[model samples]
Target chain A: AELPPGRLATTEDYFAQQAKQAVTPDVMAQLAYMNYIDFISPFYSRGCSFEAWELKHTPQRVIKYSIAFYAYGLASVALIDPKLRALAGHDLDIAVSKMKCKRVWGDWEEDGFGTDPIEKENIAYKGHLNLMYGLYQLVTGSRRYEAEHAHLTRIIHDEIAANPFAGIVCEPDNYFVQCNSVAYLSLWVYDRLHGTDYRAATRAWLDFIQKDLIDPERGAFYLSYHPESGAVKPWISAYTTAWTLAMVHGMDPAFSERYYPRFKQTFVEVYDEGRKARVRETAGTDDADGGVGLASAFTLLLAREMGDQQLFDQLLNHLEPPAKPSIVSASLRYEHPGSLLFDELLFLAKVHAGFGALLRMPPP
Target chain B: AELPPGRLATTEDYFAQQAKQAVTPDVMAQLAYMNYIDFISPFYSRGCSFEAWELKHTPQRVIKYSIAFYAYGLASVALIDPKLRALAGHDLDIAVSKMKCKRVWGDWEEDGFGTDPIEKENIAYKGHLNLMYGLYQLVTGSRRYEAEHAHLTRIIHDEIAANPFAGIVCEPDNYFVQCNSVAYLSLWVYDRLHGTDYRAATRAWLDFIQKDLIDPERGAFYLSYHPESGAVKPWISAYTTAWTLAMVHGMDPAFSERYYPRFKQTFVEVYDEGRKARVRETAGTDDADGGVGLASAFTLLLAREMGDQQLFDQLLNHLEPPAKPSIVSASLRYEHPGSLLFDELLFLAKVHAGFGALLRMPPP
Candidate 1:
C-alpha cells in the first residue's frame, strides 16, 4: 500500500513507515468487527471447535469450545472497538467468571479434559486462562474480576517457586513455549497492576530457555522441553513459535530480538522458498492447527512485531475477502468462516496490540 | 553528540550519527594503530593481559594475547588507513598463517588452551581465529590465506552438522552467543567470497538461538548455556548480549529488530540510570567482558540499526575522551584503551558492516 502523501523514504518519517503498512487502524478494526460479529453468532454458541472450517462449513462435535480461546477472542474484540465491549463485555465476563469458578473451586470435569481433574488442569491450561482472564479485566476494567486475577497470580507464582524447573513448567514435563510465554505475560500484567515483582522467577525461566531450550547455533526452540531433565522434543511449527514470540516481545523486547529473525526465516522465507511447495505436493495436513492456517494468523502478528510490511502484505494476500453474504444469521448471508474462533481471536489479539487505541473499554 | 551540520535526522544521515560516536573510523583506527605499537612492543615482548590494569598499571602474568585478537586489531587499523596496510596487513597475515599452521593438520594445542591438541583449540578459540582471519580476508582481499580459510570453513560447517546440537555447539556444552555469532558471521563472509550456501545451517543456528537461548520473559541470554544436558549458567553481564546482538544485527537485519529495543533498554536506559547515580557504589568486576564497556560500544551500533538517535547520543555521552599520552613509543599520546583487542576488533566489525566506505584495503 502507498504511504500518505508528502512523505519520502529518505524523509525522516517514522510515522510514514508505520502508516505505509496495509494494517491501518481502520482496516484492523474493520476486520475485527466483521469477525467479531461472526464469532458471537449462534452457530458457535454451542462451541463445537475453534476452527473456522468446522464452525463455518463442517459438521463437528458438540463439545464446548475452549473457554480460554472464547474469552480471549471476545476480549480482543472489546480491545479493538470499545463499543463492542457493550455488546460482548457481559458475555466475556460471564464466560471467564464461570470458567474460573470451576477451576478456582477445583473441578476439572467441567473443563472438558476428562473425569480426572488432577491430570486435566495443568499450568499450561491455567496460564491460558490467566492470560484470557487478565486481558478480559484489562478491557473491561472491572474490580469484580480482580480477585480472580490475584488468585491466579498467586497460583502461577507458587507454581513457579515450587516447580523444580527453575520457573513455571507446564503439566509434568511439557515446556511448551506458548504456555510459558502466556504464564510470563500474565504475570507481567499482574505486576503492571498490582506491583508484585515476579521478575526473579521470570529471569530463572529466561535463563533456562537460553541455556537448555534454544539450539546454540539456531535461534529457534524445540516444540517442547522437559524443564526437570532438560530433555527437549523437536517440534518446529510456525503456529507455536509465532505465538510464543509475540508474547515474548510483549514481556521482554530484548528476548524477542533473539527469535524474531528466526521466526521470519522459518515461517516466511523457508516456507516461501520451497517448503510450501513441498507441503502442497505432499497434500496438506488435516491437523486443525496447521490446516486452519493458524500459523499464518500467528505469523501475521509476528510480522507486525518485526515491523515487516512485506510479510504482512504477503499474509493478507491469502486472506480470502469477506465471503458473500446470505440470509444465514440475521440474514447476514455470511460466507464460510475459513478460520475457527481461535484464529479470529488471535486476529483480535493482534489487532488489540497493534491498534489498541481504537478500543473503547467499559468504565470501571 | 549532535549530527553533523547540514545533516538533518530526517535525511537518512546514517554516517552522521556514526561519526558522532567514539568509535568513528578515524578514532578507532587511530587508537588501534597506536595500540598495535604497544601490543607488539618488546617492553614486555613475551605477552601480557589486554586488561588495562595489568597492561598499563600492574605487575602482571606475562602471557601472549590471543593471536586472533592482535591480528584482528591490526587489520582494523589497516582498514581505516591504506598506508598502514603494508605493515598491519602483513603482520596480520603472518600471525594468522602461523596460528593456522598449528591447526591445519589437526594439532590444536599450540593455541595455548592445553597440552592436549584436541582439547585446546576447540571451536570457541578456532571460531574466534576464523572470524579474525575471515574479516582480514574481506578487508585485504588476499588469496595467500585462501587455503586456511577454506579449511576453517569446512571445519566449522562439519562441526555444525555433525554435532548433536543444532547449528554449532561450542566445546564442552558451553554455548557462548559471541562465539556462535562469530562462527556464523565468518561463514557469512566465506559465502560472500565463494558463493556458498551455508545459510541453511546458519538459519538453523539462528532459529535455535531464538527458540532456546533467549529468555522468553526478559529477552536476554545467559553468558553461557550447556548444549548437551540443557543446563544453563546465569551470567547477566550486558557486555556479552550487546556484543552478540550487534553481530547478529549485521548478519540479519530482521533479527536485529527483535532485540533492538531490549538492547537499548539494557544498555541505554538501565545502564544510564545506574551510571548517573553512583559511579562507584556497585564497585566493578575486573572480568575483561564487563570492564571494557563493550555493552556501550555495541549499543551504539545497535542504536544505528534501530535508527534511535537519542540512545545513540546517550551511549556517546559515557565514552571518555582519549586519555592523555605518556609516550615511550613514537612520542604518541592516546586514550586509555578501556577495552583490549576484542573491543577494538568488534568496533572494526561494526564499522565494516555499517560504513564499508571508510575502509581502504591493501592492494590485491
Candidate 2:
C-alpha cells in the first residue's frame, strides 16, 4: 500500500502535490467550497455555483476565487500548448462571462432560490468535475492581463501546497480522499508537459483514498469520511465511485487491476440492486436527479473494461437518447412502467464528456 | 358547437391600453402593452405586442417569451381580488425583474438568452399562464382589488371573444382554447361578484372546447388543435386537456353534462393507458423538464372534480404531494408519467392553486 503525501498539490507543484500531498490548498479551497455547500445543504455548492456569492464574496467572489484557482491550473496545464490552451481558453472565457451574469435566486428561499437541502446528503460529483474541466477549458482563453494564467495557477498551487489532510468532508473533520482524483489528474497533466513528479504524488494520494474509502461490504468507495479516524461512511454515490475507478484505471492499470475487480463486481451488483429495487420496491420509477444518468455510463465502461459479455450486452443499450429533462423524468418515472426523463439532454452531454465511447471496442 | 370567444375573449376593451396609455403620449401608445399573449392563441396573429416584437426570431428561445407572457396572465387573473392583489403585485414585480434576466441556449448561431423569438412559439402557453396566474396570486391578496382584478379578467374575456373557433386550422395556434379556460373561470369569478352575463361566454367556451378538443369516444379532451378547424392533434399535452375538463366542469354543469360520461371513461382510461404504454410513452418517465408534474396535477384535479372517487382516492393517497422542486417528483406513481419538463412545474402549481392545495397538499 502507498503512504500519504505530506505536502499540498498547487499549480506550481501539481506533480509533487499529487505524489506526496494528502491535501493541497487547491483541494482545500475546493473542499471549503464543498463544505460551504454541505453546510448550506440542498443549495449553493462549489461546481453548480448557483449562489449569489459568485458575484462578490467579499468585494471579489469566493466562487470567483475558486474559479480563478481552477482556471489557473487549467491554463497552466493546458496553456503550455497552443491548441489545448486555445481550447481551454475558449471554454474559460464563456464560463467567466456566464458566471458573472448567472442568476442565483437566494439559494432556495421563495424568490431566494434556496439550495436543495438533500444536496449535501448525496452529491453528484462527476457533474461537478465535468463542469470544472469545462471551466478550465474556458478560462484559458480569458485575457491574461489581469490574473494571467500562470500567476493565478501559481498562487493557488502555493496556497494549496500549504495545507495537507484538510479536504472536503461530510463532517467537519473528515476528508474525502477523492479530492486527489482531481488533483492527480491536474498533476498528471502538469508532469506530462513539464517533466514534474506530480504523477508520483498522485499515485500516493490515490492509495489513501482507495484504502480509506473502500467499503468491504458494498465494495464501493464511500464518498466522505471523518478526517481524524478516516472512518468511511455509507454515503457512496455511484458516479463518485466510478470517477475513482476511472481515475485509477487511467493513472495506473496495476492499481486498477488490484482493486477494480471487486469494485467492478460491486458496481454491477449495486446497479442491478438499484434497478431491482426500483422495479420491486419503487415500482420501477427512476428519477433524473443525482447520478441517475451515470449508471449506464459506469456499466458501459466496466463492461467494456472487464469484458463481461453479458454485462457488455446489457450496458450498451441501457440508456435511450436524451429525451426529457432530468427533473421531470425523475419524478414521474416512478411506479409500474414509467417514461424517460427529458434530462437525457443534459445527462447525455455530461456522460459523453466524462466517459467517452471507448467502450465500443474494436474487434482484435 | 359554440366556439369560445376566440381572440375577443382576452382583451381589456377601453382599459386594454391602460399601462401603455398611462405612460405614453399617444392613445395608440396604450396598445403597445397589448401583446397577443392575452389571446388563447398568442401566435394566431402577428400584431400582439410581445408576439410580434418581443423576441429576436430565434427558434429555441422563441418559445420562452410565450412562457413569460403566460406568467404575466397568471398573476393578473388569479390575483384579481383585493386579498390577492398585493401578492400578485409582488409576483408581477418579481417576474418583471427576472423576466429581463432569463436566458435560453442551444440551436442558434450564437446561443444565449435575451427575449425569445416570436413570443408565442417559445414558452408553452399553459406554463406561461401558470406563472402568470401564480404571479397574480403573489401580487394581489386574492380578494379586494376589483379594478385590477377586472382588468386581468378582461384579458381572459377578450381572448375568448377573439378566438371564436377552437382548433389549429385558424393559425399556428394550439393552446388557444386552453388559455380560454382561464378566461372562462375569470369571468365566472367576476360574474359571481359583479352580476354579469359572463356565464354565457363561459358556457360557450365549454361547448366548443369539449366538442373540438376532447375525443368523443375516449372522453379525454384532445390535447391541442388548429384554431380555425379545431382538429385533434398528437401534440396535445395531457395537462392541457385534463385542465380544460376540470375548468369546464366548474364553469357549466349543463355543458359538462355532455362530457361527464366521456370524462368518466377517460378518467379511467388514462391510468390504464399510462400503465400499458410503459416507459416508451411520453408519460412513462418523470423528467422534471418534461412536464410530468403538470400532467399529473391536471389529471388529479379533474379526477377530484369529477368525483371519480376511486381515482381521486388513489391520487390523494398516492400522488397528491408533488416533488419539491415542485415540478420534479420522486414518486413512482404514473398518472401521466413521462419525461419531466420545466413547464410541468408551472402546470402542477396551477392545479394546486386552482384546487387550493398544491403547496398545502401533504406528501404522500
Candidate 3:
C-alpha cells in the first residue's frame, strides 16, 4: 500500500483545537507567547528559561540532551519565524549553559570517554550540543562552543568509515539511529555554515541506514543495535520512529518522506470516531521515560512537518498540563515536578511552523 | 462585612471552559450521558456500574462508603433530572450490588465491630450505605437494603446522647464531621419519607456542630475529633469543610449557607488575577488519597450548590483526564488504575442540577 498522502482517515469527527481569530504567524506567536510567559519570563533565577522542575533529568547515561535540545528548539522558533526574534536573548543563553554542564556529560566516564566525552561514542550529547552551538551563534552571535561544534562534525566525518551500520554508539555497545541522525544534521549545518564538504559522509550513512538500521519487517528504525556483535534488537516504537524521522527530515526530507507512511501504519492507534489519537509503543520496551506523552510530542512534530493537520491537531488534545502549578499560581504556568524536557519538547513541537526548517537552518 | 453573595472575585479572566449552546438541563444530561457511557454502560461485568478501577477503595475502617456513595450519587441524577430517565436500568442495579460487596464493609470487623458493624460506631459506612438503600429503592423499586436502612436511623435515633459530640464514631476514636453530616442527611431523608421526628436529633447535632465542631478562628470544620482524649485535629481542609457543608445543605440549608462564605475564605486560594482557583489544604494532613483532585471535586460541588458560578466554572478547567484509555479506544473513554471514585464523584458533582435536591430526595 503506497500510502496515499499518509494521513490517517480516522481521527477528527468530534475533538478539535479551539484557538482562532488571528493571522497564522501571529496565532502561532500568540500561542508561543503564552508558552513564553510560563517557560521563559517567569520569576525564576536569571537566564533560567526552563522551570526548576522541568530541568529534572536522568543522572545516568542513555540520553542527556533533552533540556539543551528543548531550550534550543524553543529558541529556534525565533530563527524559524521572525515573530519572536527579539526574546531579549537571556533565556537562550541559559539554554546554551545547560548543554555545557559537566554533570550531563560526566557519565561518559563509564564508557571510557571521561577525558573527552566530546570525541567518542557519546554522540547523543556532543551532536545535540553542536546543534545548540550553531543555534546560539545565530540567535545571539555568540560562539564559545564553535570549536566544539567543528570537533563533533570532524568526529562524525572520521567515524563514518568505522561503523557499517552508519549509526554511532550513544553508549558502549548501544547504537541508536536517532543519535546519529542528530550527528549528521550537525555535520550538514557545519558544511552549510563553513562551506565544507560532508555530502560523501551523508551518502555513506544513508546507504548504511537503508541496508541495516531500518528494520526490514517494520519499516521503522530498529530501537537500537549492538555494533560489536552486529546485534539488531528489533522493536518498533513510536518514539524511535517519530524522533528519528523528524531529525532525519531536516537532514534528508526525501528519506524521511519515504519512511513516514510505514511509521504511521505500525504505531498509531486512532479511534473515538476519529477524534483522539495516541502512539502505541511496542510492549515491554524499556528505556521509556514517560512513553506515550513524549512519543506524542515528536509525532505531532512529524505530523506538522508532513502537513497532516488532522494528526497534528488530534495530538494537541493529548498535550499534558504540568500537575502542580497553574493551580496555586495564576499565570497558566504548569510545572510538573517531573522532567521539563517532555513539556519543553511539546511546547516547541506544537508551535505550528517549519520545525524541520529550524532543525536544518544554516547561518542567516 | 456582609459578603455580596461572597463570590471569590479572583478566578476568572483568560482561562475558560468552552462547551456551550445547549440548554441547561439538556447540557447537564448530555454531560452525564457521556459520563454514563464511561461510568455506567460499558462492557464490564453486568451492573458493575463503575469502571473496575473506579471501585478500588480504602480497606481501613475510617470510611467504606465511597463506591456506594458514588454509585448512589451518579444514579441520583435520574431522580435529580428527567433528561436521563430512560437510560436502560441495567447498570444502576450493578451500582447497587457494588455497595453490597462484603469486602468493602468487612473491615468493620477490625474495630470490635464484628457481626454487628452496622449497629456499632461505624457511622461513616452505615450512614452512606443507608442513603444508597434509600436511593436504590427510589431508582429501581428495590427493597433489599431498606430494612438495613431503617435499622441505621433507629440506631442514630436511639444513640443521640450517648456522646455529647453528636457526631458518632466512624471507627474507635475517629470523628469525621463529614461522616456525621452524611448521617444527619440520612436521618432527614428518612424523616421526609416516613414522617419520623428527627428534628430533635438534627437540632442536637447542629448545636454540637456549632459549639464544638466548627473552629472559631477558621470557621471551617476541624478535620477530626477524638472524644475520649478530648483531642481535636484543628487543621482546616477544603475537603472536610466542603463535603460536610454539602451533605449538611440537604439536611439544613440555613446552616450550609451560613458556613459557605467562611469555608471559601479559609481554604480557597485564587490567583492569576482571579482566573484560577484551588482548594488549598491544611499542610501535614494525612488520610489523603489523591488530595487536590478529590478535594477539588467536593469543593466544586459546594461551589455549585452555593451559586458561585465563577468558581464552579474555574474548577471546570481543572477537571483531570484519567491517565489511561481514551487512547487505544475510540469511545471517549478514560480509566485510571489509581481510583475511579474521584472521577465518579467529580462527574456526579459537576452535573448541573439541584444536587442538594438529589441529596434530600424523598420517594414518589
Candidate 4:
C-alpha cells in the first residue's frame, strides 16, 4: 500500500494551479455552459432511467459514469481552488445533487435496497453515490451525507472480508473490480475523515487484483470477475488501466506503479514520432466519437498525474475535441460533440487535470 | 505540363508493382469475399435504388462513390500487372459490369437521357459511367461500351462550350466541378485511344478551376458551384482537394503542380516532429470512422502520386483500419470494420496505392 514515485508531486502540478485559470468566472458557469438540462431532458421520458441509451452498459453503470464523473470534476474544482467551494457553494450543491438523481439509482428497490442504498452489496449503486458524497464533503467540508457515506464505506469493508477474492461484489452475479476499486477510494476518503486503515486492511484484495486479475501476456488488468463462474473477464482498455492508476494510486502506490508502465506499453501508442498519442480502447468497435471519449479523459488524467508531460501534450493534442463558444468564452467551454454526459463533463472538469489530485485529497 | 518532379516515377511506384502481391489469387476472390450481395441486397428491395443510405449525398453521388471506386480499384489491379487482365478477365469483367449496373445509371432517364445515358446534359450519370467504361476497356481491351463512350465524350465537349463556366453540369441546378473533372479523365482515355486532343481542348475549364474554383485564401479548390445562383460553395476537405489533384493532374500537369503545394499547405498538418500526418477534413463533425475513410483513401493516393514519400508513410501509418482474416488472408483480406461499400473497397484497392497511377493511365 505504498505510493508510486511521482504520485505525490501532482499536488503541485497543473492541478494545484487549475483554479487560477478561471480568473473571473461566475457561479454555475462551467456546469451550465454546456446547457445542463440538455443532458437530462432527453432521459426524462425514460423516467430518467439512464438506461444506457447507447445500450453498451447497464443503467446503473452509466449513471455512475455520469454522476460520479460530474461530481468528481466539480469537487476537483472546489478542492483545487477552495475559494470556489464558498463562491459557487449553492450552484455546486444543486449541480452535484442533480447529477446524483434517480436516473442512476433507479434500480435500488429491485436490488433489495428496501430502505437506503447503503443497506446492501449493490456497490454499483451505493458505492458510486458514496464516493460522490465523500467528494462533496471533502471539497466543501460539509458533513451532510456523512451517515450514508460512513455506512457504505464500512459495509464495503465487511463485504470485502466475507468475499472469496477479498473483492466486493457489484451486481448480483458479477464482480467488477473497477466498481470495487471505486469503493476502495471511498474507504480511503472515509479513512482520512475517521482515522481508519482500510487501505492496509484491504491488502489481500490488492494481491488478488494484482496476481489473479491481470492479463499476464498483454499486461492488461482484468477489471471484471464473476462469482458463480469464478472466471475473470478482462476488458482491456487504456482508460480503464489509467483509471485504476488514478483511483488505486491513493490506496496503494506500489499497485498503481506495477501497472502504470504496463498500461502505457500495452495501450498507449505514440504515433507521428511522439507528435500525437492514441490510447487503445478495447471496450467495443464503436469509434472514439461514439462516447469512448470518457476513456480518453481518464487516460489524460493519468498522464497529468504521472507528470508525463510529453504524453500529456501528445494525448492533449489528439484530445482536442473530435473537432467549441462565447458568454462562456471567458471560461472553459466547447461546442459539445454530444458526448454522453460523463465524457462531456470529464473534458470540462479535467481541463486543469485535478481528478487524480482530487482522489489524493485527505478527506474534508 | 511538367511532372511535379516525382510524378513520372510512380510508373515504378507501389502502384505499378501492386498486382504481383496477390500471388496467384482466384477469380472473384477479392470482390466476393466481402459478401458483395450485402451491398446490393439492401438496395434491391429499394429497386436497387442505391439512394445514399447515409443520406449525405444523392443517389447518383453515392453510386459514383460506390461504383467508380470499385471500378477504379479493379482497373488499377488489371493495369498494375497486366497478366491479371487475362487471369481475372472473366471475374474482373463481371465484377466491373456488376458495379456499373442500374444502381448507377438508373437516373439517366430522369435526367433527360431518354435514348442513351450519353445523349443529354446529364453528365452526372453519363460521365461517371463513361469513366468506368474507359477503365474497363483500358484493363481488358474490351470496347463494348464504345458508342456511348464516344458520344458522352462528344456531348460533354458541347456542354462545356454552351455553359458559361466551361464546366459540365452534374444536376440541373448545380455544377459540381469534381463531376466535370470526371469527364476530363474520361476524355483523357478517349483521346489517348483515338489520338484526339481533349486535354488541350479543355484548357478553358482548367483556367476556370485554377483561377475561379480555388479558395484563394485557404488554397482549396471549391469543387461545387450553383450554376443557377452563380454563387460557389466550397466543401473544403483534404480528401476532396486530394481527389482534385489526382483527377486534374492527369489532364493538366502544370495546373496540378500549381495547386499541389497549395493543397498540402491548406489541408495537410504534420505533427510528431515529422512522424505523423493528419489531413484537416472540413467535411463535417463525423469522425474519421464514419466513411471518412474514403476521403482518407484519396489523400493517401495523392501522397503516393505526388511521391510525397514522407507524407505517404505518415498518412499510411494512420490509415491502419480503426480495427480488422482467414480464407482471404493469403489474398489481402480483413474482417472489415464495416465501412460503406465505397470506403471498404477503396481500402482493399488502395492497399498498394494504385488509384492515382490508375487515374494516370493511357487508353488501351
Candidate 5:
C-alpha cells in the first residue's frame, strides 16, 4: 500500500485530492494572527491556558506553571513580531504576572510551599516551572526575581533525581512519554543557562526510555506505562509519538538520529491516499487525540527538522487548504472551543519562523 | 423604507439576491424524507416525543400520547403514501404501542383524578397530552380504549375552565402562546370526537387572544404573555406565530378572517426585498430558531391557508434552492436534530393536502 517518494500511487492520489482546494499559507498566517488579535487576546484569562484540563486541577500551582509556559511562548512571539506586539501590547504584563510562583500543588495547608513533601507525586510540573521561569528571564533580560528563578531550577534538578523511571519525571501507575520528553528539554535549557552538567542525566533517561518505553518490535514508544508493576500499555498515537520525537531531537541528537528513521516508518501510516493520514494504530483503536490536522502539523514540524523536504511537501499539500478561515468564521471569531490548544499550536507552527527552534540547544 | 411590491428597491434588490439560492419545496420534501428514513428511523427512541419538556413530565402517561400522536401523523402518510410506507413499515408498531396510556402526570399515587389542585403548575403538558391522544385515536379509528380516552378529554375540559387567561393553558406567572394554541387544537379535536360543541369556549379564547395576546399595534401575536399583570411579552417570532395562526384559522373563521391580513403584514416582514425572504427582526436579534429553511416552511403553510398566492409565489421563489440538501448530507442522513419536528411537520403539510383542516368541524 505504501508508495515510493514522488510516486502518484494510491496514497499519493488520496493526498492529491486533499490538495485540490487548499488554503494558501499566507491566508493561514493572516487567520492565525487575526485569531490571536480577535479572540485569544480579548478572551483568555491570565491564569490557565487550558480549558478542559483545568477542571481536574484548579487553584493547583503545577498547572499554573503550564499556563505560564504557554503565555511566555506567546509573549516571545509578540515581542519579536511587530504587528502582533502592536495588537497585543496590553496582554504582556498579564502573561508575566501569571508566571509568578505561588504555593506548590500538594501544599494546600500552608500558603507558600511551607508544608511541602520531599518528593511530589507529579514531578513533571517542576521541569515545566523551571523552564517557564528561565524563559521569562531570557525574554525580559531581567534578573529581578533571580532567587525564585534559581530556586525553581534547584527543584527541577531534585525532581529529576527523584524520578521513579531513572531520570524521567512521570506519574506512577500510568505514564506519558511526552512528559518525560518535555522534562528533558527543560534540563537541556537548564544546562545551557547555568553551564551545568545534566548531559549524564539526559543520556541515562534516554537509555531507560530506549530500553523500557520504546517497543523494539514496533519502533514506537509505548503510549503509556506502569513503572511499579512494569506493565507497558501497548498503544500507538501519531500526535504523542511525533511530539515526543520532536522534543527528543532537541535534547539528545544521537538518540533522535538512531530512532528518527524508525519513527518515520512506523508513524507515517496513510489512509485513503488524499482523504486521511494517521499514525498506524492497533486493532479496535479510535484515533481522535488532538485531531488529524494537529497530528499532521506535528509531523510537518518533525519532517522540517529532519530535512525531509519531500515529506514536508506531502504534509503541506494535505494541510494548507482546510487551514484557511472563511470570512464568516473570521468575523464571528469562531473556534472549536474543545480543541483551542491544538488550533493555536498549529497556528504558531504555521506562522512563526522560530517555532520549533526554541527548544534546540545553541550550537557550540 | 418600504418599497412597493415588484419594485427593485434597495431591500428588494437584497431579497432578490437572496432568492437566487433558495430552498425549493421539492428540496424541502427531499430533506424531510431523508431526515426520517436516514436519521429518525434509526436514531429516534420509540416512546418520547418532546425532548426538552420531557424532564418535568416523564414517567407519566400523558406525553406518551404526544409521542403517539406524532407517530400517527407520520404513519398516516406511511399508510397512504406508498413510498413512505415501504421505507418505514417497521416504525408503525413503535408508534402504536407508545400511544397506549398507562397513568396521567402526577397520577402515580392514585389511578385517576385523585391528585387535586385548582392552580396547577405546568398545565401546558396536560393540554398537549389530551390533544395528542385525541388525534391518535382519530387517526387509528380505535374506540378500544374509550374509557381512558374519555377520562383524558374530561381533564382537558376541567383544565381549560381552570385557566386564568380564560382559554390559555399556562403556568401561573408566565405563558407560552404556542402551548395555548396547541390546547385549542386539541379541544377542537375533542369537540369532533364526542360531537360536543366547544365553539363557545373556542370563541372566548380567540376573543382573549385578539384582545390581550394579539399585538393590535404590531399586527402579530405576542410571542408570550405575563397573564397576571396583563402584560403581553413584546416579541414576534415567525415560526410560532405562523404555527398559531394556521391552527387558529381552523377554529374560528371570524377571528382568522379579521387577523389574517394583520398576521401577513406583521409576520411577513422581509429582508433584502427580493434577496432573502425571512421574518425581519431588530439588528441584534438572531433569527435562527430551527434554521431559516424550517421557518420558511412554516410561513409557506401559513400563506397557503390564507390563499395568498402572490406571497406563496414570492416565498417559493426565495425558498426552493436552499431546500436542496447537498449529496453528502442526504447520503449521511444528516438532520439538524433540534429541527426534526419542524422538518416532519413541513413534510406532512406538503403531502397530506388539507393538513390543518383536520380540526375543522363538518361545515353543515
Candidate 6:
C-alpha cells in the first residue's frame, strides 16, 4: 500500500523529461535512418503489469486488459507520427502483420466474448496483441493503414460481441463483460476517423463505465464490467488501472491525474504499512505477492514518468520471467514459448532482412 | 464398500491379443539381435512390480522397472536365436567398437574412501546405458561395444565389497539399493565360461540377504537392507523382488524354482486373496504401485516354458508402458516433450541390438 521505496514527485519529473527527450530532431531523423527498437513496447510505452507472485490476490492474469489498452495507446502514437503521410502505413498494420499477435481466442462461445477473458490460461494470447500495435507504430508511423486494421479490428470487435451461449457454455454468468476502460479505444478511433455514430456508442458506454466501474471514493477504476447490467466485476487489477489511465489519457488528462492521489493514499493505509506491521508482529517477515490495483500503477508509472532511472529499471525487472534459462537471448525473453506463433519468428527474420528497404526513408 | 467398476475382461483379453499377435518376424529378429540378452536376463528380466486394477487394486508407474526388465527380456530372446550368431560377428563387431560409455564418475565415493560402488544405478541411468545397449542391439549388434558395463560392474564389486559396512546389501535396507543384479549376472557368466571364482562373492551376499531381506510371510522382497545389522528399510519394492528372483535364476536354478513357489504362494495368499481383499473392503479403489513381483515372472516363464501362449501374452501386455505418449516410441498423445529413456524400452532395444548379432552366430 505504501508505494515502493521512492520519491513520487522526483519520479514523475524524471519520466516527464524522458517523454520530451525521446522525440528530438536528431532522434526523429535517426528514426528515418534506422528503427532498431521496433516492437519493444508493443501497444503502449507507459504500460505496466506487476509480477505473477503479486497477481495471486486477484483472480485474473494482467495481460488481458493491458493488451487492448496498450494496443490502442500505440495506435495513437502511430496516428500522430508525421511519417504516416510520407512513409509506409499505420500502427495497427504492423501490429497485425508483423507481431502475429492476438488476444486469447476470446472463447466466443463462452464468456459471450467482449474481448479480454482475463483468465490465467489465456494470458499468452492476450499479451501478443500488445506487441502487434507496438510494432505497427514503429513501421507505419502516422499513416492510416486502414483496410488491414479494419479487417482485424472488425474480427476482434465482432468476436467480443458474439453470444457465448451459442452452445452450452461454462460459466455463463461471467459473460458479456468488457474491460471497462476499453471504451476509450473505441471512442478515440471513432472520434479521429469522424465516425460520429461509433463515437456516440462509445460515449454512452463511457458514461456507464465512469459511473459504475470507477471507485468514486478512491478515484480508481475497476478492470471489468458486465455490459448488460453496467455493473463492475470485482477485481482490483493493475492492468485495469494502467488501461484506465490510458483511457483517461485519451479522454481527459486531468481526470487521469486526479485518479492518482487516492490510489496513493489507499496503498499507504491498506497494504504497505498496515500489512507489513501485522506480518512483522506475527511472522517477522511479511512476504506476500505484490498487489495490483491503483497503488501498483502509481508506483510503476510514476517511476517511469518521473524518470527515477533505478525505479524504471526495477519495474522493467519485474516484467521479466522469474526463472530464465541463461542461454535465451534477452530480446526473446518476453515471448512465451507456448503461445508464440513460430511463424512469427520467420516473419520477424524476413522483416530484419528487409529492414533497410522498408524502414529507411526521408525525414518527415 | 464396493470397489470402483473396472473394465470388463474383454479389454484385458484384447490387449493380451495385441501383445501376442503383434509380435513380428522383425520383433523376433530384434530378439535374436542382442548377444548379451541371455546373460542379462538372469537379472534384468525379473518381473515388474506393477499391480493391476482388480476389483480393488490399480497400478502405479513402475514403468521404469518394467522398461528395464523388458529390455533385458528382449536381450534373452535375441541370445537364444540360432541365426543371431551371424549378427554377432558383423553387427556386434561394429556395436562393441562404437559404444564408448564411461562408468559412473567417482563410483565408490558414496560410502567411504578407497572403495567402489555397485552398478545398481545403471538401471536408473537408463538414458545412457539403456540407450547405448538399445542402439547397439537394434541399430547394430557388437559385443566389443564401448559401453561401460564392465567398468560399472568393477565399481560395484570393488566399492560395495570393500566398504566396512558392507553386508547383505539387499533391498528394503538403510540405503536404497538398485538394479545391479550383477550377483546373478556374475553367476551365469561364470557358469557359461566355467570360471567359478565369482561364486564365493555371490554366495556370501546371497546367504546374508536371504536371512532377512525376504518377507517370509508376505512373500515380497523388501527394497534394501543394512547388512551389518540386517535392518530392512521401509518401502517393500517390486523391483527388488524382481532382482531377487533374477539372482536366484543364475546362482541356483532349482533354488530359484523353490523361491518361485514361495513367491506364488505369497501372491495368491497375501496379494491376491488376502491383503488385496482386505484393502478392497476399506478403500473403494485400490490403486497400488509396486504390486508386480516374482509371481508375474513365474506366470510368464511358465507360459513360455510350458507353451501356454495366453499367459505369456498376458505377461508381456501387462509389462509394457501404460497407454500412450509412452517412454518408448514417442506417440502423438505424449504432447509434453520429454526424453524417452525408460528402463523397459532400453532393455528391449539392447536386446534387439545385441541379440540380433548373436542370432547370426553359429550355435554354442
TM-score of 6: 0.33
TM-score of each: 0.39, 0.33, 0.43, 0.44, 0.40, 0.33
Q: Model 6, range A68-175, lDDT digits (tens) per residue?
A: 323333332332344433322332443344223232243322323344432321223322442243234344444344444444444434443453311011122222
Ranking by lDDT: 3, 4, 1, 5, 2, 6
Q: Write the per-residue lDDT of candidate 4 for residues A1-364, one digit (tens) a residue.
A: 2222222122224343554634123224444542344444222221334433433243343555665565566665565555555543444455446445655555554423344556656676666676777677766677777876677677778877777677766434446666777787777777666777875656777778767577755656653555543434324545556776777766676677667787777667677676667676543233342113355566777776566766766665565434232234433343433344534444443443444566556443
Please identify which of the two predictions, 1 or 2, would achieve the higher DockQ against the true structure.
2
Listed in order, the DockQ scores are: 0.00, 0.02, 0.01, 0.01, 0.01, 0.01
lDDT tens readout by residue for model 2, A24-139:
34332332332233324211333444443332222221233234333433333232233344443553553444333334212212222224411231111222332344344333
Number of the top-ranking candidate, with DockQ as the measure: 2
Error of 1 at B114 (Å): 5.5
The DockQ assigned to candidate 3 is 0.01
Candidate 4, residue B296: the lDDT equals 57
What candidate 5 gets wrong by more than 4 Å, as runs, is A1-119, A144-146, A198-200, A271-276, A281-297, A307-309, A316-324, A327-340, A352-356, A359-364, B1-364
Whole-structure CA lDDT of model 1: 0.49
Q: Tell me the TM-score of model 5.
A: 0.40
Per-model CA lDDT versus the true structure: 0.49, 0.37, 0.56, 0.56, 0.48, 0.34
Clash pairs detected, candidate 4: A272-B275, A272-B276, A275-B272, A324-A335, A326-A329
The CAPRI class of candidate 5 is incorrect
What DockQ does candidate 1 score? 0.00
For candidate 5, write residues B1-364 as lDDT tens digits: 3543432222233223213433333433443443444224321444544342242233343344334334434433443344444333334344444443333343322322224422343445555555655555555555654665567666656766777666653433446665677667776787787888654577677767777666665556654555433434333545656767766776765666676677666546455564445543211233433212245656766675565555654554455334432334343222332232443443344333233445531221
Candidate 4 residue-wise lDDT, B1-364, digit = tens? 2222212122233442554544223223343332212112221111223322433243454655565665566665555554444432333343345445555566666556464555656666666777776676666566666776677678877777677777777556677666777877887777766688865656887778766667756657665777678887756656667777777776776777777787777667676677556676654453542225455566676766566666765664455333232222112233533334534343343433433455555444
